[PDB]
């Protein structure tokens, strides 16, 4: 109810402020335009208010002109500032206090004086006119009794307009009323996860009465709500309320015994129970199965959530007096679902935008080190005055009183001039404010969140090479295939990637897998490891998907972090029934647990590590004397292993793999730089101690061959470093900070590893 | 009058005497079977063998219904039906000893269950079991004393044709609020497709599931106003609230016109409402078979085109 | 004062936390005679964690004893 | 180190692969020889005498008794 209740006089103020901005060269319409427009309309009840207070039109124009500035502006786009929008919000409350249902020019002055932050409020203060003085000025210048007591009426509350209007339910609300077109089969059930916002559905039904958009049946229909918070004599009060519904014919029940009532059809009750507790009681009863059917009411999409907050924009941008931009709302929902996706939607966005708007309000509503230095002196002078009056020293007290008055005069002038520029501007909601708040919920650095998703994909190969040196064929193969689905070329339903790890164990498959999550999700530990060693029997299939009803893993874990990497170890050793489940993941992109909840895997990366074909790769290395198969093309190696892979598995299963990944072998030169990387990583952990470690190439070569083994790979390298470098390094640490802040040089003389201590 | 049994259990003859619940329709075959077992000298304790949810509850309800209707034979004439729920289960054994004494003295109390070996051995208590088949072969069959005292009764799902008569019998009991007309074609069409898709809960509970949200887009859809009362009522709303404000504002120059306009609008609203219902109450909105299959489309996900053949 | 709240002797409390790990092998051999092949393996594996090389979130040690 | 390698292969046969990766160091023990057992009995004599410090009783055991 914005312009419906506006009278002729109220609407004239809107046009007056529009034209005044052009003459005043103001690109925005603030409180200085609304106050002057009201003074130009001496037709309302407030006309006698200003006349009785010796307030004219010419005096307020010059008073407000000095406070505001003058400068170049933009022609057109003259909209209302959020601070001036507080008048509309408060005018509704004033009407409810006096049980009035009209909006006129008599509430504009109250709104501009109840803010105490706009330019118009300061004009009233300078004219010895406050809220109390004008409080009494306006005064003199001016049925289902049982149902209403045992429940709450929604159309009564919605008539005033105190609750937030339901915005974004343009399909769920319309779906309910479309089915509500017969005496029978007219009991829809709101089925969805707890937190999707099924309570607002009841409010939306009563909202149509206020807006007169309801049909004849719903016209002036009391939407009753039976809350669950008010819970022999149990089945006694409910039998009297239902009698009033039949006779009146305008009472709607909203639940969150009654079986005979719905056998014929007379109550348009709409359920709100969750899916986990709806098929266990309603479905098992034949009588309750003739009126109730589950309805798909889930959380809104990313785009849908944005539209929800657009309707509620006026309920928050004016309450906090903070300008809310369109780009802030769309970025808030996208970033919230990226990291904190446990409370579902849209309830997790209401509080997120509330703290974001409040945080910028706090930062833009303080003293810029100007009024603080003046107020402290005023307080100190006040203490000095007390020290003189109690001391009976009035000779020095005369100067204190004069100085106190002078400081207070400067305090008001400094405070007014500080907010003169503040009132002329509006504090918008920058995208950085939302990013800072969401960063504090998960601990992710601001740099990682602040990405345009344009350079990360381009530099994907470089990031992977930082953690893994060598086997560039496997690095480039996965980087090119992963971006195919991101750009939209691949099927959206299918997952982003379905790479399969093949080759000898211990080569570093796990190390490369963790780098994928680091460079994409920005989290090294965002990976769920499921081992098929414990999945051998047939009954193990009902474990990762969830316990079937009637008896009492992976689905539960992946739901918390859908933006992770799912890694499997020893996939070749698993029950045949497990492979059928995996095929559905890579085909439809989503699964469903035993509780009816549909989980999503479009953001998950499925990697299956198998040891099949490892014996073939190692034979090719020593097949030819004087060399190996490393010089062969990667496609040739892929084709040879493809035939072996399909021998033990099904041919149709491999058709769903985006790219088969075959790892290479580790040579002597490859391990040399691996040792170098680990030393640098240890130096990073020693940055607090500010100790530099340098390792010569002689030491790297000696330690590389100490645990070299084709079957193991890079695994013995970690053990060798611990027993060679870390053993002597730890001894010097516990020597009284002997090597603290210094530089340590590691050199291999041929038999031992001599350590040289030098300055840094 | 067995006061102990009337307080520690639930009486069925009192509920059936008022007849406020829907009558048991389609279980007429089991009505004669229950009384037949109770009349036998040996194994006079029938057991409702079957899965929980097939309709074993209606079997006990119909037993007491024949008492009010005077359809029970002389052997089972003027006998109350008592059922002991499993939710009221040491001090537990101290209550069952007093209840069995009253049953023997009265001679007309029939127990219904869902320690007692000496009671069943002598046939003093004519309890009717309701345990499932899985639990009947694990605790009752293992005991020889109760093997020759409990007579199993095959209580399974009824036939497809038997379910059809259930809807027809209860049709008259389903039209007493808004006086709507239900076509006979939808009754037979509500059992053919019920077993085709929903076959996980057995008859008749799984059978009567199609008519829940199938055809509800005809009757009240035409009861709406095509932009007729959407604006007339809105005009009345604004005049009333604005009228009260003008009274306290000492503004009766425009209030006089508002009262005449409001009175005229009230007369028009009644005339528009009366003519709307007069031209619609005469016609009847019967069910159609084209919308019966619409509800089952969303239960399983099958497109409506595939179902409609 | 802190000695009277836990019963720890004053000598144990007054330590530099550095000489204790330097003579760890000598102290362990006072109560454990023999099996020196495992004494040195665990002594050199605990000082590295205290030196800050190991990740602070992880526990100090994760030894797995094996044998008869 | 060779003994550690041989035991490691059999250790992962009945255990999860990544379970042993997080272990800082696998520790393998040995048996007890006759010479080691001689000092083990000696330690128990010293511990028993230490517990009798309040008794102010000195206990000395010959090497012949320890071997027996
Ligand atoms: N190119 C490389 N550069 C640096 N370090 C490497 C490289 N390749 C492998 N590594 C190291 O090898 C180590 C091997 O240990 P890890 O627990 O990751 O097992 P893995 O060899 O990947 O085998 P598995 O798949 O059987 O678990 C990793 O911790 C990683 O630091
Ligand atoms: N290295 C050692 N030197 C001397 N005595 C030892 C040594 N190791 C063990 N002992 C002795 O072994 C005895 C038995 O110790 P304890 O009862 O704790 O069992 P354990 O041998 O460690 O075996 P378990 O692991 O089966 O409990 C102790 O009294 C201890 O004196
Ligand atoms: N589509 C929507 N439009 C406006 N407000 C909504 C919407 N969905 C939820 N809300 C608001 O979110 C708040 C929380 O509702 P919630 O408790 O999640 O309902 P439920 O418990 O039924 O899921 C409600 O007060 C409601 O006003």
Residue in B53, B178, B231 nearest the CB of A284: B53
Nearest Cα residue in chain A from C46: A730
**Ligand 2 center–CA A5 separation, angstroms:** 91
Q: Ligand 1 site: residues with CB under 6 angstroms?
A: A 468-470, 505-511, 609, 674, 677, 713-715, 718; D 17-18, 21
Q: How many CB pairs lie under 8 A apart between chains C and D?
A: 50
Is the beta carbon of A158 within 6 A of some atom in ligand 3?
A: no
Which residues are paired to A294 by β-bridges? Answer: A189
Ligand 2 atom closest to Cα of D43?
4
Report d(CA A174, CA A196) in Å as an integer.
17
Ligand nearest to C-alpha A503: 1
Residue pair A704/A671 in contact by the 8 Å Cβ criterion: yes
Nearest Cα residue in chain A from B202: A284
CA diameter of chain B: 99
Find tokens 């001599």 and name the residue: A754
Report the candidate in C55, C25, C26, C51 with the shortest Cα–Cα distance to residue C40: C25
Residue in C34, C42, C66 nearest the CB of D7: C66
Radius of gyration of chain D (CA): 21
Find tokens 């003027």 and name the residue: B78
**D27·C63 Cβ contact <8 A:** yes
B55 Cα to chain A: minimum distance (Å): 10
Chain C residues inside the 8 Å CB shell of A730: 44, 47-48, 50-51, 53
Residues of A with CB under 8 A from a CB of C: 682, 685-686, 688-689, 722-723, 726-727, 729-731, 733-736
Q: Can you give the three-state secondary structure of B88-139, one letter per residue? A: HCCCCHHHHHHHHHHHHHHCCEECECCCCHHHHHCCCCCCEECCCHHHHHHH
The four Cα atoms A66, A68, A69, A75 give a dihedral, to 10 degrees, of: -130
Ligand 1 atom closest to Cα of A609?
25
Chain A residues inside the 8 Å CB shell of B20: 260
Q: Do chains B and C touch (3 or more CB pairs under 8 A)?
A: no
Burial of A317 (0-12, 13-18, 19+ CB in 10 A): buried
Among A505, A506, A531, most D C-beta atoms within 10 A, so best to mutate, is: A531
Q: At what angle do helices A172-179 and A199-211 cross, to 10 degrees?
A: 70
Report whether B218 belongs to an annotated binding site: no
**B238·A178 Cβ contact <8 A:** no
The dihedral built from the CA positions of residue A433, A434, A439 and A444, taken in this order, carries a sign that is negative
In this complex, which chains have at least 3 CB pairs below 8 Å with chain C? Answer: A, D
Q: Is A469 helix (H, G, I), strand (E, B) or coil?
A: coil
Residue A352's φ and ψ, nearest 5 degrees, are -65, -45
Report whether C67 belongs to an annotated binding site: yes
Report d(CA A396, CA A381) in Å as an integer.
12
**A217·B229 Cβ contact <8 A:** no
Report d(CA A307, CA A313) in Å as an integer.
10
**A734·C44 Cβ contact <8 A:** no
**Ligand 3 center–CA A200 separation, angstroms:** 5
Report d(CA B217, CA B199) in Å as an integer.
27
Distances (CA, A) of A135 to A107, A129, A131, A321, A449: 11, 10, 6, 24, 51
Residue pair A572/A611 in contact by the 8 Å Cβ criterion: yes
Strand segments, DSSP code E, in chain B are 10-11, 45-49, 80-83, 109-110, 150-154
Return the number of other C-beta atoms located less than 10 Å from residue A198's C-beta: 21
Residue nearest to atom 29 of ligand 1 (CA): A511
Method of determination is: cryo-EM
DSSP state of A695: E
In this complex, which chains have at least 3 CB pairs below 8 Å with chain A? Answer: B, C, D
Residue pair A600/A610 in contact by the 8 Å Cβ criterion: no
Token reading at A721: 């470093």
The torsion region of residue A546 among left (phi > 0), alpha (psi -120 to 50) and beta comes to: left
Among D8, D15, D16, D24, most A C-beta atoms within 10 A, so best to mutate, is: D16
Report d(CA A649, CA A481) in Å as an integer.
23
Q: Can you give the three-state secondary structure of A625-638, one letter per residue? A: CCCCCCCCCHHHHH
Token reading at A604: 């998950």
DSSP state of A317: H
C5 Cα to chain A: minimum distance (Å): 29
Q: DSSP for B12-32?
A: SHHHHHHT-SPP--S-HHHHH
User: Half-sphere exposure (CA, 13 Å, Cβ side) for B129?
Assistant: 27
Ligand 1 atom closest to Cα of A714?
12
Report the candidate in A727, A725, A728 with the shortest Cα–Cα distance to residue A704: A725
Report the candidate in B76, B58, B86, B89 with the shortest Cα–Cα distance to residue B126: B76
Chain B residues inside the 8 Å CB shell of A47: none
Residue nearest to atom 9 of ligand 3 (CA): A197
Token reading at A409: 């005069």
Find tokens 């109840």 and name the residue: A114
Q: Can you give the three-state secondary structure of A199-227, one letter per residue? A: HHHHHHHHHHHHHCCCCCCCCCCEEEECC
**Ligand 1 center–CA D64 separation, angstroms:** 56
Report d(CA A499, CA A478) in Å as an integer.
7
Distances (CA, A) of A237 to A151, A230, A234, A244, B96: 12, 13, 7, 12, 34
Report the candidate in A266, A252, A261 with the shortest Cα–Cα distance to residue A287: A261
**Ligand 1 center–CA A671 separation, angstroms:** 11
In this complex, which chains have at least 3 CB pairs below 8 Å with chain D? Answer: A, C
Residue nearest to atom 8 of ligand 1 (CA): A508
CA B65 to chain centre: 15
D44 Cα to chain C: minimum distance (Å): 10
Among B216, B225, B266, B276, most A C-beta atoms within 10 A, so best to mutate, is: B216
Chain A residues inside the 8 Å CB shell of D16: 531, 533
Chain A residues inside the 8 Å CB shell of B21: 260
Report d(CA A42, CA C51) in Å as an integer.
82
Radius of gyration of chain C (CA): 15
Give the β-pairing of A605-610 and A565-569. Answer: parallel
Resolution value (Å, 1 decimal): 4.7
Ligand nearest to C-alpha A470: 1
């Amino acid at each position: 109810m914005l312009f419906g209740r506006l009278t002729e006089r109220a609407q004239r103020v809107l046009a007056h402020a529009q034209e005044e901005a052009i003459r005043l060269n103001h690109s925005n319409i603030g409180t200085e335009h609304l106050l002057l427009g009201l003074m130009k309309e001496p037709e309302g009840i407030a006309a006698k208010v200003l006349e009785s207070f010796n307030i004219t039109e010419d005096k307020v124009i010059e008073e407000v002109e000095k406070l505001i500035g003058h400068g170049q502006d933009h022609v057109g786009t003259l909209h209302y500032t959020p601070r001036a929008k507080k008048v509309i919000e408060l005018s509704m409350d004033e009407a409810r206090k006096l049980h009035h249902n009209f909006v006129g020019t008599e509430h504009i002055l109250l709104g501009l004086i109840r803010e105490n932050e706009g330019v118009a409020a300061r004009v009233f203060a300078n004219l010895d006119l406050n809220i109390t003085k004008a409080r009494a000025q306006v005064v003199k210048a001016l049925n289902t009794p049982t149902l209403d007591s045992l429940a709450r009426d929604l159309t009564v509350i919605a008539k005033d307009g105190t609750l937030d209007p339901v915005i974004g339910r343009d399909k769920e609300i319309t779906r309910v009323i479309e089915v509500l077109s017969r005496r029978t089969k007219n009991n829809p059930v709101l089925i969805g996860e707890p937190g999707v916002g099924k309570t607002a559905i009841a409010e939306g039904l009563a909202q149509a009465i206020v807006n007169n958009e309801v049909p004849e049946t719903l016209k002036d229909k009391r939407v009753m709500s039976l809350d669950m918070g008010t819970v022999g004599e149990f089945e006694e009060r409910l039998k009297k309320v239902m009698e009033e519904i039949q006779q009146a014919g305008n009472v709607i029940l909203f639940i969150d015994i009654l079986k005979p009532a719905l056998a014929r059809g007379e109550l348009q009750c709409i359920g709100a129970t969750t899916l986990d507790e709806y098929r266990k009681n309603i479905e098992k009863d034949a009588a309750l199965e003739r009126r109730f059917q589950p309805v798909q009411v889930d959380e809104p999409s990313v785009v849908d959530t944005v539209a929800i907050l657009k309707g509620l924009r006026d309920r928050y941008e004016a309450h906090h007096r903070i300008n809310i931009s369109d780009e802030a709302i769309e970025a808030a929902v996208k970033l919230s679902n990226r990291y904190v996706s446990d409370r579902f939607l849209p309830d997790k966005a209401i509080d997120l935008i509330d703290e974001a708007s409040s945080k910028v309000r706090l930062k833009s509503h303080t003293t810029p080190n100007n009024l603080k230095e003046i107020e402290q002196e005023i307080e100190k002078v006040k203490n000095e005055k007390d020290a003189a009056v109690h001391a009976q020293e009035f000779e020095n007290a005369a100067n204190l009183r004069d100085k106190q008055t002078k400081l207070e005069k400067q305090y008001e002038e400094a405070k007014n001039e500080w907010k003169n520029a503040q009132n002329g501007m509006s504090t918008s909601l920058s995208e950085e404010d939302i990013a800072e708040v969401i960063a504090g919920w998960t601990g992710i650095p601001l740099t990682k969140i602040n990405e345009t998703e344009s350079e990360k994909l381009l530099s994907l190969e470089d990031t992977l090479h930082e953690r893994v040196i060598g086997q560039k064929d496997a690095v480039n193969s996965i980087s090119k295939a992963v971006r195919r689905a991101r750009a939209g070329l691949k099927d959206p339903k299918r997952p982003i990637g379905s790479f399969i790890f093949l080759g000898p164990t211990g080569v570093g498959k796990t190390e490369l897998a963790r780098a994928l999550a680091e460079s994409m999700f920005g989290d090294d530990d965002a990976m769920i490891r499921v081992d098929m060693s414990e999945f051998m029997e047939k009954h193990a299939v009902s474990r990762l998907v969830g316990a079937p009803p009637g008896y009492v893993q992976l689905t539960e874990k992946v739901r918390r972090k859908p933006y992770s990497v799912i890694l499997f170890d020893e996939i070749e050793k698993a029950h045949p029934d497990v492979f059928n489940i995996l095929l559905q993941v890579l085909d439809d992109g989503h699964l469903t647990d035993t509780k009816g909840r549909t989980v999503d895997f479009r953001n998950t990366i499925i990697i299956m590590t198998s040891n099949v074909g490892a014996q073939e790769l190692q034979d090719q290395r020593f097949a030819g004397f004087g060399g190996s198969s490393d010089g062969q093309d990667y496609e040739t190696i892929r084709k040879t292993m493809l035939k072996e892979l399909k021998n033990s598995f099904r041919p149709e299963f491999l058709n769903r793999v985006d790219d088969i990944i075959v790892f290479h072998k580790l040579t002597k030169e490859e391990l040399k730089e691996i040792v170098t990387m680990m030393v640098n990583k240890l130096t990073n952990r020693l940055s607090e101690q500010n100790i530099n470690i340098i390792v010569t190439d002689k030491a790297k070569d000696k330690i590389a061959e100490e645990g070299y083994d084709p079957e193991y790979g890079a695994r013995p390298l970690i053990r060798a470093i611990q027993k060679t470098i870390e053993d002597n390094l730890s001894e010097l640490i516990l020597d009284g900070n002997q090597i603290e802040g210094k530089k340590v040089t590691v050199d291999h003389d041929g038999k031992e590893f001599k350590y040289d201590i030098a300055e840094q």
